[PDB]
Every structure is written in C-alpha cells, then in structure tokens.
Amino acid sequence: QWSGARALEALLTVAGELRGPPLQLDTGQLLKIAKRGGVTAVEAVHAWRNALTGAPLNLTPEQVVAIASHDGGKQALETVQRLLPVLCQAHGLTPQQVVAIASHDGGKQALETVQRLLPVLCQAHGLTPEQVVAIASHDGGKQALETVQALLPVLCQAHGLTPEQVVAIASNGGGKQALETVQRLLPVLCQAHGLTPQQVVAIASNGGGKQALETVQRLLPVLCQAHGLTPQQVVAIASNGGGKQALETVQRLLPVLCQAHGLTPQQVVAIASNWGGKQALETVQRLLPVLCQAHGLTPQQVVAIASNGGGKQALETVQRLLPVLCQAHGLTPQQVVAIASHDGGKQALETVQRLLPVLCQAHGLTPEQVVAIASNGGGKQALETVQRLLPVLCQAHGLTPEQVVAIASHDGGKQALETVQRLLPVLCQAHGLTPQQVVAIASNGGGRPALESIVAQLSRPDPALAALTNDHLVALACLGGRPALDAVKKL
DNA sequence: TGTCCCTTTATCTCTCT
DNA sequence: AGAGAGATAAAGGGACA
Secondary structure, three states, X not given: OOOHHHHHHHHHHHHHHHOOOOOOOOOHHHHHHHHHOOHHHHHHHHHOHHHHHOOOOOOXXXXXXXXXXXXXXXXXXXXXXXXXXXXXXXXXXXXXXXXXXHXXXXXXXXXXXXXXXXHHHHHOOOOOHHHXXXXXXXOOHXXXXXXXXXXXXXXXXXXXXXXXXXXXXXXXOOHHHHHHHHHHHHHHHHHHHOOOHHHHHXXXXXXXXXXXXXXXXXXXXXXXXXXXXXXXXXXXXXHOOOHHHHHHHXXXXXXXXXXXXXXXXXXXXXXXXXXXXXXXXXHHHHHHHHHOOOOOOOHHHHHHHHOOOOHHHHHHHHHHHHHHHHOOOOOOHHHHHHHHOOOOHHHHHHHHHHHHHHHHHHHOOOHHHHHHHHOOOOHHHHHHHHHHHHHHHHHHHXXXXXXXXXXXOOOOHHHHXXXXXXXXXXXXXXXXXOHHHHHHHHOOOOHHHHHHHHHHHHHOOOHHHOOOOHHHHHHHHHHHHHHHHHHHHOO
C-alpha cells in the first residue's frame, strides 16, 4: 500500500465532522489547514473546537483557521488557549494581536517569547507593545525578538540607527538574519559605496533582507561600472522585493533586453524594482515578442504591465486573455493593458472576465466603469465588493451607482466600500454629515482609515481637534485622510 | 513526521506630496 | 494620482530530534 493512505483517511474522517458546529469549515478552509498545518493540525482543531470557539476565548472560526494553518499549528493552538489570557491581561494586548502572533510557523515559540521578553523589551529598551507585536508576527518571531533584545544597543549606538529602524528591519521573516547582517555590513555599505543608513535599512527591511544586503555588496561594483547603473538604481532594485534574485537577474538580462528588444536601462530597472522582479524580467524576455506580434501590444505597454508586483502573472494572463476579452467582451487592447498594469493584474483580468457580464447586465454598469474599478491594485477585491454591495448601498443607503463606482475606483476600494456601508448611518444620522461628504472622504486611497478617523473623533472627541468644524474635518479628511488628521492632532 | 526557521513570489492596502 | 512603502499570505527548502 501507499503508506500515506491511512494518514489521508484520518484527515477525511475528522474533516467531515468539522463542517458541523461550532466551526463548520468550507473545504477551502479545510484544504488550507491540511496543506500547511497537516494532519495533526486538522485533528487538533477538532480536539479543541469547543474550547476555542465560545467561552472563554471566543475566537471566530476565522481566527481559528489562521492559527491552525501553519507548521506546528497544533502547538500554536495549545499555546493560544494557554497564553491568550496571560497576554491579554498581563500585558494589555488585544486578542487580535495575540492571534496575529500565533498565525505563523512556530507560533508557539513566538507567543512564549513574547510572554517572556515583552517586559524587558518595553522597560529596558523603550519599545512599545505594538512594536513588540510587529516583530513577533512573522516566522521565527522568537529569533527576531531575541536578536532585537541582544542587538538594539549596538545598532542604535555603535551604528547610529533609531529604534524605529531596528524594528522595521526585525519585522520580516528572517528578522534575526537581517539584523545580524546589517550589523556587519552597514559600515561596509555606507563607507565603501556611499550608501546612507536609510538606504541600507530599506534593503534590509524585507524578507530575505540578509540575502539582498550581501548581494548588493557583491554586485554593486559590477553593476555601477559595467552597466552604468547608478547606486540609486541598485538600491531601488534591492529594496523593492526582488532582492537578491532581481539583482542577479539584472546583471544577466540588462544587455539582452536592451540590445535584442531596444528597452532602455531605465525601463529594465523599473521591471526589476518589484516583488518577483526576476520572474518579471525573464517573462518579458520570453514574452515581449509574442505580445508585440503583428502590431500587437507595443513595447511600452509590455513594460508597463511588467513593472508591477507579480508582473510575470500579469503578462501571462494578458497573453491568455487579450484575445478573449477584446473580442467576446468588447474591450480595447488599451483597456486590457490598463487593468493588468497593477499589482495583482492577473487577479483583476480574471475577475473582469468573470464579472464584466454580471456587472453590466445585472447592475447596469458600463464596461468603462467596470474597467475603472478593476484598474487599481486589488481590483479583484473592489470588483467583488461592488458586486456584493452595489444593491445595499444604492437601495438601503441612497447612493447612486456613480458614487458607489467612485468609492471603488482606488486602491483599497473594497475596504472603502465595506467601511462606507458600515459607517454611513452613524455618520449621517448621528452626526449630520451629508452622504456626498461621506462619499468624498471615501473616494481616495486610504478611504477606510480616513472614515474611521472621522467617526472616532465625532464619538470620542479629542480637544486637540475640537477647534475644527464638521466641514473642516471633512475638508481635511478629503485632503490627506487619516495622516492629515493625525498630524493636526499633534498640534 | 512534526516543528521551527528562512527565503522568494504574489496580492492587497495605505502613505506621501 | 503614480511612486513608494509595508502587511499578509502561499509555497518551498533547510535543519533537527
């Protein structure tokens, strides 16, 4: 027999029951736990399904799936029920914070290390709990917390970094690695190649920070002199997500992409300066000619699509969907290029293809409106949220379709829509804001927190802001959102 | 294996002027 | 409003007891 067969049966036997109360997963959630948490994790969720759900912890079935779907999930589940009260009463953290900490590989380690080092890290090191929680909310949070305790002094004193910078570096997977590598390489990178600490913090403050630092050190000379890249251009590549892989891939494919396709170095850097840059570059090398065939998408359009995170996914999805969307949906190549030219372009194109019919026929939008919603980062989310919420917003809340589309046509459009639908009645009914004003506020990136800031001030007012009228607060929130209100508060 | 740690890639959301 | 920045997730590999 295949030996993993008994272990697969256990999974299903137990998985079956979990669809019932008090959790009741939906296969998606169940599949997820199995893949990452594995068999012992699916069994642990079952075993502790009652202890977690209701009193005393009262975790939503959502948070339970978040804690369980990682390596050592079972251990995290046992530790949360043991340490969530300790952490929520002895340190003043919220359950949301405890869950965020639990929800990573080795979460048991992170929760225990937080319980053990938070006092020392706030008292003797002057860190907030927020910062402690942030450091702890990544795989190996335990290692990062311990490395922060050990190296905060030398990093601020001998090397001149602020605590904020140290926290920023530590708050990624492999935090301990990035920290140790910054200690050794900060003088080397600053004094030998003339980088500022700030640039060095930016290179270190991503997952694989250690790898990006050492790769900058190694390849900077070769990049700046052989290829004519500026130091500034190298940093941009190393600090934007491609990291080590994008750097190594720039050295390889800069000449190839320039000579053979007439791309400028400026355009190549922009493709590389994203998450999965390596992947975007190699995909462009392969795909540019296929896309710009028979007068197809121009080079410039191909670069534009490529120059976003997951740009590889975007390029491939265009090649697949450019014909079907242009023909069977009546979209100009220009419109398809628009929707694909953002982070998650693949997701948006796919969602346009799926919902463009439904949004026009069932909700009476134009293609141009569906394109506008989709043509932002997270466009898939904005599209799905418009489909769900268009009726309750228009019918129950009074908004026009044009207004609902307006709120949706920005990064975070989904957050902006859910938050409007949530807070419109108290904003209008309880504090006298007009709908048009609420729509104005939420029709910008950062729509959600701007609206939350406003409601927070109208319901537990700060004297710091009381000299301002409702109309002023609105004018301010449209101008600069939560940041503009936070600033004014500090004055 | 189960658990812990690290690295790359993709997606989503908010900031900054 | 595009560019910059940063949180969160999925998925794979090393390591080890």
